Structure to design on (1265 residues):
């Protein structure tokens, strides 16, 4: 029948993580999202100009 | 509910069903006895891909001009054929078992699913009108607009390719036929006949002992004249063959028949002689009939109709447009090839043509009653029961679609019919307001069928001229005048 | 049952109806001016918004910037109050050989500077007054918006 | 690997012939049809063929004779 | 390499992925078709039948 | 007399337009509920096998076992 | 595709037009020969001339040829690489196992 | 027990990852629709255009969606799905393969079953003996004593009918394998170079610094990855459609010239003569 063994239940802690390199972190594409979120937000919300008066 | 109401009369209905079957058998015996000696053999023909039969009314829809039958009796014949079609769920227990009775219950629930025997009415006209107003107009009013869209999108094509497929001369007529529910103006049937410009020229080759000859208005006029003179066959055949050789020479001077230079059709040239069989310069081998002198040119009694429907033909319609055309006409459509639905549509067409002939024998449309004319127009699918038109409008409608069906083209017929089933619903209660003008009235005189109409140029439509304004109209309209004033 | 004299009455009725329609449909909704709808146009500027309510803005020739002055380059957004009106000023096309900077009172102005607009001294004030652009201090242009000719349908003649 | 459509004829080269509806005058060929009792004998032969090939299910052969 | 494997060639898990994906596609087709074009507005506004009358005199 | 080519609505005329709009924005609403559920399904997950695992989670679909 | 295609087309045209040339040369009288009268009673000819008929008869002919002989053809193709291979003796059934008295 | 035949299938994260691929289609809203419109109208003209168009659109947008989910939304299956061969052969290639057979299957089937009646195609076939050979004998060719080998002939003729539909399958498999190899090998090579750099810098902590920059290297790699994979997806789509044209859609070229009609208001009929 269906099962749920205790072997899958193991200790967890972020302290034991090896982690990532600077290169692997750059390959995670977070630095790209960081820029392009603002890029696309700016393009969308700057395409629509409001009315104004020229001084 | 209606289930028990119909079960109450199910015992009383079997006797009427069997009586109706006997009537159908007798009438079919008579009709087939006449057809088997007066009607020609319309051979079976397969589509371009040569896997399924194709059907056209010009060859297969024969009209027995001279059928000694009352119009109401033919209505009974057709309605009882439809009742036999509706009796099909009785086979469900005999193929599924005793548990095949729930389909029979669903059959007995709705009265529109049932044959005539389950109806309380007696006259075929009242019975037909009851069935229509209860089930059939509603079923048809939900297929009309979608069928119209399919016909449009069959002409103009899919995926923004109208510049490659549509014609710039049928444009204003297309608009008036398909977008007159926007304007609210009436339509001229000739503008629907203009849709045939999408097609080629329809020809008729008479097969002789030498070559095929294209039929023309002149040759047909001469043949009708010879037929009217009532001459001996020794003179009749002689005059027919004289006209035939004259037309043969005329077309040979024209440059052969139109069919020789049409994509998809063609007449082969003389056969070639291959290799050593070639006798010097004579590279050809003429047929046997070349030996026959041209003075012996005789009609074989065989004919070949070539509609040249390159865009209108029912083969290229599709799996869906055929089904919707049969739905809109309240015909059977499910679980069959387009060939079988083509035959069903052509049989409906033949029925309507025979009914038109019998109506003309019985003294035209004006001899009919109001309910009978309403039912005729419902059969033609040009009226919906939520209109309440006048008698003159109904007569004009009948004349319109009768002329349109005289041309033997289902596409333009459906294009005309679907225009009378484009009804909207308003979101507000006050709007549409109550009108101030009277109801729409017309007459048979307002319909222009006896005159030709050139296609209006694109974005330059012209106003409509009444037939009465034409010169010598009182002489041309004298028949309609005599029929109406009386 | 409809005489020909009764037609223009019907035409008048339908004219009244369609006129009641067109007097409404002749109206149209203009461009929206709610700042809450366009706040992200200014949020997404290439420079942070300067909430200016003190000091002065001055034009002076290009070169070294005085230390303490906040440069106001093209694309700079400035939230201010002008004649009691809360406004955003977006810099566009500063002239060549010149630059613009916000000079707080702590910052001394350089030579050859022209004060374009200035603010008063109101340190105790909670709601600042802003500025007062006098006639000749700033040339504000309202759009002309020339209403073109009303589109008339050609009447066909009847002899 | 394999061929292409550019290297072969079209579905229009094959199947190029459009439709032409033939009609023939009635001389009386479909009249005086004989063998009026044909379908009766055909149905009889069909039922005979079905009967000789019939086999009723006889579960009594599985009776516990032993 | 890991993706170089015959087990991953006919992987039933990816087949379940494809199945659920395209069943959901089929479920949501009538919402993908629910975009409005403004062509019949143009036809209603611009199609103008000839309104001139006939006058023999 | 009423105006032509107009009628009252019927059941086979389908729902009104506002109802079709309400049908359209249901995926857009479930998006806000499902993307967090996707992230939770990934984040609150545990691997099913290890080098030490003598057992693996089994799921009898039809209870035949 | 290969560049030998026009060569094969030329050879195909050769055989086709030569057969047609022979048919023209011998002229009428083919129906009086024994070949025609026997082909009229030959099921191969019935099948071959029914294949090209309309009404799905091409599909019928192809599927019939498949169901009848194409299965044996598949087996034949499978058996080309089996004839040369060392195979063991066929363990013919002793026809002793299976018999059991009824009770 | 004997009758118990047991199968082990495993199952993982499928449901919630496949739901959002479809939910995103409302956001993209078929942005690729115009490109495929242009290409389909370039490659074919028929009533059944929209059908094939819709198919490709769905297929293409799904690919695009997965690619972006493979680049950005990195969870569970979205990382592997472009590195798996089953997705590229069955999840992208099979649909594009069967799309013309599902849209134009009637014509292709009729064509295929007619080509089993193998015959030489003659242009301007005004010959008479050709007809007798095609009807009596069945083919232009000499079929004498080919029934003797009919068992093979049938199946061979079947291939002879589909041989000109086979390069489409070959190109689909080839480009699926190409995309798989491209994604896998480029990811592996990039990660390998990164790991070698990390080994060089971990052993020399004077260099174990953000030497290019926190965003500079990441922004550059983002641009490189997206540019390369977008080029590859464009290559896949465009070449798949060009090969669809050159392999499957040239069969359906049927240009009909427009012939003017003259007998519009009158039609000859069976009653005109009989
Ligand atoms: C938005 C983010 C953006 C990014 C920003 C960047 C963010 C940076 C992220 C950094 C994250 C990674 C950093 C590495 C963490 C690694 C954690 C881990 O998983 O490994 C566990 C790892 C296990 O190692 P191990 O092999 O098992 O052996 C550990 C022991 O050596 C032997 O084993 P042991 O078990 O015997 O341990 C002995 C003992 C070490 O033995 C000793 O030497 C004893 C001395 C330590 C105690 C000192 C306490 C007194 C401090 C002075 C107080 C001064 C203020 C008083 C006021 C003065 C006023 C003038 O261990 C400890 O005590 C561990 C130190 C714990 C902290 C101090 C005690 C408090 C614990 C309770 C928490 C209280 C919370 C305070 C409030 C916090 C508010 C934020 O343990 C450690 O991490 C400890 C190592 C030291 C910390 C790492 C320092 C980095 C390397 C050198 C310094 C370079 C940076 C310096 C910058 C300046
Ligand atoms: C093969 C086809 C060769 C000939 C095709 C012509 C034809 O079949 O006409 C059907 C015909 C289609 O309608 P139509 O010819 O287009 O004319 C419609 C009228 O114009 C009236 O049009 P309407 O708009 O007023 O609609 C009438 C309405 C009401 O129609 C009715 O008259 C009452 C409804 C009767 C339902 C009978 C179906 C029962 C299904 C089994 C249910 C379970 C049984 C109990 C448990 C076991 O129709 C329906 O609601 C449903 C009709 C379709 C039901 C499916 C019929 C199956 C035909 C078998 C061939 C297709 C599968 C392959 O069906 C009927 O309307 C009458 C019932 C036919 C009973 C036939 C009994 C034999 C069934 C053999 C089963 C084969 C299964 C094989 C696959 C598994
Ligand atoms: C999944 C999505 C829904 C599935 C619907 C499919 C409809 C099936 C069908 O009607 O077949 C006849 C249908 C043709 O029938 P038809 O003569 O045009 O008439 C249409 C029905 O009578 C039109 O139906 P109706 O208006 O007569 O209404 C009656 C029908 C309506 O009821 C139903 O069909 C389904 C009942 C559940 C819905 C009830 C909601 C109310 O129920 C029936 O009694 C007959 C249905 C069987 O077949 C197709 O059109 C082909 C579609 C299926 C093939 C697609 C590809 C299959 C996958 C290929 C795998 C291997 C490739 C290698
Ligand atoms: C279920 C109810 C069964 C009752 C019959 C269904 C309704 C009657 C009908 O379909 O008409 C017969 C139909 C005639 O269609 P039509 O009315 O003449 O329309 C032609 C228009 O030109 C066409 O006009 P259209 O363009 O508007 O419609 C086109 C439509 C036309 O298609 C249809 O006709 C669909 C009709 C619906 C059929 C219902 C299927 C329901 C399945 C569930 C009993 C058969 C026993 C033998 C079985 C084994 C063969 O769609 C297609 O062209 C595509 C069809 C193929 C789709 C599936 C393709 C799968 C591809 C798999 C990939 C293969 C890759 C390998 C490649 C190898 C290398 C080359 O002809 C047949 O299908 C054969 C007739 C005899 C058997 C019919 C029933 C079984 C086969 C289906
Ligand atoms: C399971 C085993 C069960 C055993 C049962 C045996 C005993 C029970 C009944 C005894 C059989 C009696 C004989 C009989 O029924 O004849 C029927 C039938 C009619 O013979 P007929 O009366 O002499 O027809 C003369 C004219 O056709 C008359 O013209 P029409 O206007 O009256 O009707 C024409 C319409 C037939 O009209 C109907 O019969 C309506 C059928 C619906 C009612 C059921 O069209 C046809 O003729 C069908 C020809 C088939 C080729 C056409 C192209 C089909 C395309 C199919 C869709 C696309 C395929 C996938 C594409 C993807 C791959 C590229 O004969 C057949 O050809 C049966 C074929 C059925 C299978 C077709 C499946 C096609 C798809 C195969 C895919 C590839 C896999 C196969 C390899
Ligand atoms: C028996 C021989 C079987 C062993 C090898 C099979 C080679 C077939 C030799 C037959 C030559 C006739 C032409 C032909 O088959 O075809 C020879 C083919 C060309 O065939 P296609 O033009 O149809 O592709 O050329 C080749 O590429 C293979 C032959 C290599 C030498
Ligand atoms: C299968 C039985 C066909 C009987 C027949 O007449 O057979 C006739 C056919 C020849 O017909 P054709 O001359 O039309 O090709 O024989 C063969 O093709 C070979 C069949 C094998 C015969 C045994 C050797
Ligand atoms: C126009 C440019 C032309 C030059 C082309 C240069 C090749 C560029 C290939 C781009 C494709 C590489 O694809 C990219 O591979 C990297 C490296 O594994 C993956 O990166 C992922 O795996 C690596 C492996 O260690 C992890 O360290 C990293 O944290 C994670 O993001 C990306 O998720 C994937 O998108």
């Amino acid at each position: 029948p269906s099962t749920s063994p205790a072997d899958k239940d193991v200790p967890m802690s972020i302290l034991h993580t090896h982690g990532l390199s600077y290169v692997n972190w750059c390959m995670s594409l977070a630095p790209g999202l960081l820029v392009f979120e603002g890029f696309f937000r700016a393009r969308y919300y700057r395409s629509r100009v409001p009315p104004s008066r020229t001084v | 509910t209606a289930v028990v109401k119909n079960l109450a009369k199910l015992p009383a209905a079997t006797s009427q069903i069997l009586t109706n079957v006997s009537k159908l058998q007798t009438f079919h015996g008579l009709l087939e006895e006449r057809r088997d000696k007066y009607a020609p053999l319309a051979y079976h023909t397969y589509d371009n891909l040569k896997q399924k039969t194709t059907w056209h009314p010009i060859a297969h829809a024969w009209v027995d001009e001279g059928l000694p039958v009352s119009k109401k009796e033919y209505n009974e014949y057709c309605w009882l054929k439809k009742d036999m079609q509706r009796l099909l769920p009785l086979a469900s227990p005999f193929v599924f078992g005793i548990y095949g009775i729930l389909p029979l219950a669903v059959w007995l629930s709705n009265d529109g699913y049932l044959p005539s025997a389950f109806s309380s009415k007696k006259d075929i006209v009242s019975k037909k009108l009851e069935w229509y107003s209860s089930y059939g107009d509603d079923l048809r009013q939900q297929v009309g607009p979608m069928l119209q869209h399919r016909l449009k999108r069959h002409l103009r094509g899919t995926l923004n390719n109208e510049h490659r497929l549509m014609l710039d001369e049928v444009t204003e007529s297309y608009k008036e036929i398909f977008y007159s529910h926007y304007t609210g103006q009436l339509r001229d049937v000739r503008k629907c006949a203009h849709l045939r410009l999408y097609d080629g020229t329809s020809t008729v080759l008479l097969l002789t002992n030498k070559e095929p000859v294209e039929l023309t208005s002149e040759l047909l006029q001469k043949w009708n004249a010879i037929k009217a003179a009532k001459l001996s066959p020794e003179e009749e055949k002689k005059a027919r063959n004289e006209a035939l050789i004259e037309a043969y020479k005329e077309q040979e001077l024209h440059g052969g028949p139109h069919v020789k230079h049409m994509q998809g059709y063609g007449i082969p040239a003389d056969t070639p002689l291959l290799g050593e069989n070639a006798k010097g310069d004579q590279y050809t081998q003429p047929p046997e009939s070349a030996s026959i002198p041209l003075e012996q040119l005789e009609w074989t009694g065989d004919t070949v109709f070539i509609p040249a429907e390159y865009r209108t033909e029912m083969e290229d319609w599709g799996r869906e447009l055929t089904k919707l055309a049969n739905q809109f006409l309240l015909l059977p459509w499910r679980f069959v090839s387009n060939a079988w639905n083509q035959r069903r549509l052509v049989s409906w067409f033949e029925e309507i043509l025979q009914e038109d002939a019998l109506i003309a024998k019985e003294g035209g449309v004006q001899a009919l009653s109001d309910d009978e004319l309403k039912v005729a127009l419902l059969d033609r699918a040009v009226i919906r029961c939520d209109e309440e038109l006048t008698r003159g409008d109904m007569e004009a409608r009948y004349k319109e679609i009768s002329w349109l069906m005289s041309l033997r083209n289902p596409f333009i017929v459906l294009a005309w019919q679907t225009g009378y089933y484009r009804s909207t619903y308003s979101p507000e209660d006050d709007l549409p307001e109550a009108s101030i003008l009277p109801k729409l009235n017309r007459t048979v005189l307002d319909v222009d069928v006896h005159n030709e109409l050139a296609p209006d140029h694109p974005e330059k439509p012209l106003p409509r001229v009444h037939p009465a304004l034409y010169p010598n109209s009182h002489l041309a309209l004298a028949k309609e005048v005599a029929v109406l004033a009386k | 049952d409809v005489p020909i004299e009764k037609i223009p009455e019907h035409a008048n009725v339908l004219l009244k109806k369609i006129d009641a329609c067109l007097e409404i449909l002749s109206k149209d909704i203009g461009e929206v001016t709610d700042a809450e709808a366009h706040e992200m146009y200014f949020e997404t500027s290439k420079f942070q918004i300067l909430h200016i309510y003190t000091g002065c803005v001055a034009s002076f020739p290009e070169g070294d910037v005085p230390p303490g002055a906040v440069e106001c380059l093209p694309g700079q957004v400035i939230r201010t109050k002008v004649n009691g009106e809360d406004v955003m000023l977006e810099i566009d096309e500063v002239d060549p050989g010149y630059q613009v900077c916000w000079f707080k009172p702590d910052v001394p102005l350089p030579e050859n500077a022209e004060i374009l607009w200035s603010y008063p001294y109101e340190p105790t004030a909670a709601l600042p007054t802003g500025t007062t652009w006098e006639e000749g201090q700033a040339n504000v242009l309202i759009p002309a918006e020339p209403t073109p000719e009303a589109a008339v349908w050609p009447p066909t003649p009847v002899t | 690997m394999g061929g292409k459509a550019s290297e072969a004829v079209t579905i229009a080269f094959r199947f190029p012939h459009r439709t032409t509806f033939l009609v023939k005058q009635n001389v009386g060929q479909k009249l005086n049809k004989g063998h009026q009792t044909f379908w009766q004998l055909v149905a009889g032969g069909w039922l005979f063929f079905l009967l000789i090939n019939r086999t009723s299910f006889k579960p009594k052969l599985a009776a516990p004779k032993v | 390499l890991i993706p170089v494997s015959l087990v991953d060639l006919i992987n039933i898990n990816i087949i379940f992925y494809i199945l659920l994906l395209y069943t959901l596609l089929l479920f949501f087709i009538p919402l993908f078709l629910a975009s409005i074009n403004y062509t019949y507005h143009y036809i209603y506004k611009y199609y103008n039948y000839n309104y001139n009358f006939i006058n023999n005199n | 007399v009423p105006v032509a080519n107009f009628r009252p609505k019927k059941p086979w005329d389908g729902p009104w337009g506002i109802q079709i709009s309400q049908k359209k924005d249901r995926p857009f609403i479930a998006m806000w509920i499902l993307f967090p559920l996707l992230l939770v399904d990934h984040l609150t997950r545990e691997y099913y096998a290890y080098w030490h695992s003598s057992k693996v989670p089994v799921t009898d679909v039809f209870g035949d076992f | 595709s290969s560049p030998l295609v026009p060569v094969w087309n030329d050879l195909r045209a050769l055989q086709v037009f030569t057969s047609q040339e022979y048919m023209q040369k011998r002229g009428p009288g083919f129906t009086n020969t024994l070949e025609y009268k026997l082909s009229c009673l030959n099921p191969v000819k019935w099948y071959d001339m029914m294949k090209v008929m309309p009404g799905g008869k091409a599909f019928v002919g192809t599927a019939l040829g498949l169901a009848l002989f194409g299965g044996w053809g598949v087996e034949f193709v499978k058996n080309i690489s089996v004839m040369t291979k060392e195979k063991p003796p066929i363990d013919w059934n002793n026809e002793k196992l299976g018999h059991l008295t009824r009770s | 027990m004997l009758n118990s035949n047991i199968y082990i299938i495993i199952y993982g994260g499928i449901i919630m990852y496949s739901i959002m691929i479809i939910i995103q289609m409302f956001l993209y809203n078929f942005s690729n629709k115009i490109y495929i419109e242009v290409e389909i109208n370039k490659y074919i003209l028929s009533k059944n255009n929209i059908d094939i168009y819709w198919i490709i659109c769905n297929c293409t947008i799904i690919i695009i969606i997965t690619t972006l989910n493979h680049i950005i939304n990195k969870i569970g299956i979205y990382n592997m799905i472009e590195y798996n061969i089953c997705y590229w052969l069955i999840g992208t290639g099979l649909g594009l393969y069967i799309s013309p057979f599902i849209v134009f299957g009637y014509k292709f089937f009729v064509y295929i079953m007619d080509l089993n009646n193998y015959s030489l195609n003659i242009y301007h076939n005004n010959n008479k003996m050709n007809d007798i050979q095609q009807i009596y004998n069945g083919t232009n060719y000499n079929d004498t004593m080919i029934f003797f080998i009919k068992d093979i002939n049938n199946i061979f003729t079947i291939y002879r009918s589909i041989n000109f539909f086979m390069n489409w399958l070959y190109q689909m498999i080839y480009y699926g394998v190409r995309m798989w190899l491209v994604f896998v090998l480029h990811s592996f090579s990039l990660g390998s170079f990164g790991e070698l750099i990390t080994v060089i810098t971990d052993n020399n902590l004077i260099f174990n610094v953000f030497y290019i920059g926190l965003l500079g290297l990441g922004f550059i790699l983002y641009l490189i990855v997206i540019f390369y994979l977008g080029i590859q997806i464009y290559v896949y789509i465009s070449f798949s459609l060009s090969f669809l044209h050159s392999t499957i859609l040239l069969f359906l070229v049927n240009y009909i010239p427009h012939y003017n009609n003259k007998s519009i208001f009158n039609t000859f009929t069976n009653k005109s003569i009989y």
Helices of chain A lie at 22-27, 30-47. The two ends of chain A are 79 Å apart (CA to CA). Residues B 88-89, 91-92, 95-96, 99-100, 102-103, 106-107, 113, 139, 332-336 surround cardiolipin (ligand 2) (CB under 6 Å).
